[PDB]
Amino acid sequence: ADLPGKGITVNPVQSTITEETFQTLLVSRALEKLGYTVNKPSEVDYNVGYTSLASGDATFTAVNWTPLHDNMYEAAGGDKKFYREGVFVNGAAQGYLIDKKTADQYKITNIAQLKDPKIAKLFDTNGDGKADLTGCNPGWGCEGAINHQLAAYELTNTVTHNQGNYAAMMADTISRYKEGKPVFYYTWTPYWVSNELKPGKDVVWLQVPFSALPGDKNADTKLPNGANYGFPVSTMHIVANKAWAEKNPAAAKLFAIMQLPVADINAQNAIMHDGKASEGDIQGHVDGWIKAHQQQFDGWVNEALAAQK
Numbered sequence: 001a002d003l004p005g006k007g008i009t010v011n012p013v014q015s016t017i018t019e020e021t022f023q024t025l026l027v028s029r030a031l032e033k034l035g036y037t038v039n040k041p042s043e044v045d046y047n048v049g050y051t052s053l054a055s056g057d058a059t060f061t062a063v064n065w066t067p068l069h070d071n072m073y074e075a076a077g078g079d080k081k082f083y084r085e086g087v088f089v090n091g092a093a094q095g096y097l098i099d100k101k102t103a104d105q106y107k108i109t110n111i112a113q114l115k116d117p118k119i120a121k122l123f124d125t126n127g128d129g130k131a132d133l134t135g136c137n138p139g140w141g142c143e144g145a146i147n148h149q150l151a152a153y154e155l156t157n158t159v160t161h162n163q164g165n166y167a168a169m170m171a172d173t174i175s176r177y178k179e180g181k182p183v184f185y186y187t188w189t190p191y192w193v194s195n196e197l198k199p200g201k202d203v204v205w206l207q208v209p210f211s212a213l214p215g216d217k218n219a220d221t222k223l224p225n226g227a228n229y230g231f232p233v234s235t236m237h238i239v240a241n242k243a244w245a246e247k248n249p250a251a252a253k254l255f256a257i258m259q260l261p262v263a264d265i266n267a268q269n270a271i272m273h274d275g276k277a278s279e280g281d282i283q284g285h286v287d288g289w290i291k292a293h294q295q296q297f298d299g300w301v302n303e304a305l306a307a308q309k
């Protein structure tokens, strides 16, 4: 009769990106149905998350990105210290965008065109002549990807990687876009930005001149027709402490089979951004998703409970 997680405490970890909370708590709810006591997530830098997971201070994360986290994953112990099975979120996109108005006028389709200082000046916001790319916070996996690519594409003389607080910077970028000025930024899905600036209407994605990712000399981000946006279709995974997973087969199975559509996280993140972003609202987003997918959610729980436990 007794549920397998009775008496066992779970510590989730995510980053300080509040938009990660929904998917983290979805896993927490599932573990609670398996009987576990789940604490509120710790919100720490990704790299701190991975070392905590490897030591056993943290139990799971649900925001492990491939390939952007590969270097942090391997560095912290890789498959020797971590359990990682299945695919939690498929079909994420990332890349570089400029406003469609500017792209159409000057016929800009490739980031390599920003080597021309005249083109780059269009996107200068601080007057130093260089294009100002709204980029990634220190510690994000995309920090390393963007730095690597600007160097590889010979863009460091005309393009600046602006770093700080991405969410605040993007509000300024949207404000500038609304004044009718050119903008240049990196983003990903799922996140709230793509709801405000939509490709084909407001903005366009830029291609890159060849494949370049840090730590993999033979990376190939090309699509079958030869078009390249600089990043592959990306996925998120649930990652757990390996030793904990070996002792908790019901949880291990649950982690391998849970799946959340990228569109659902996009929708939740958009609602948060329109003002409903308190802890209490996010809990209700999670509870409402479950009620709307009750058969699926219960199926995951039933499969986990039927593991050899």
Ligand SMILES: C[N+]1(C)CCC[C@H]1C(=O)O
Binding pocket: 046, 065, 068, 069, 094, 136, 139, 140, 141, 142, 143, 188
């Ligand atoms: C901030 N991010 C959510 C953007 C894509 C993956 C991740 C990161 O760069 O690590």
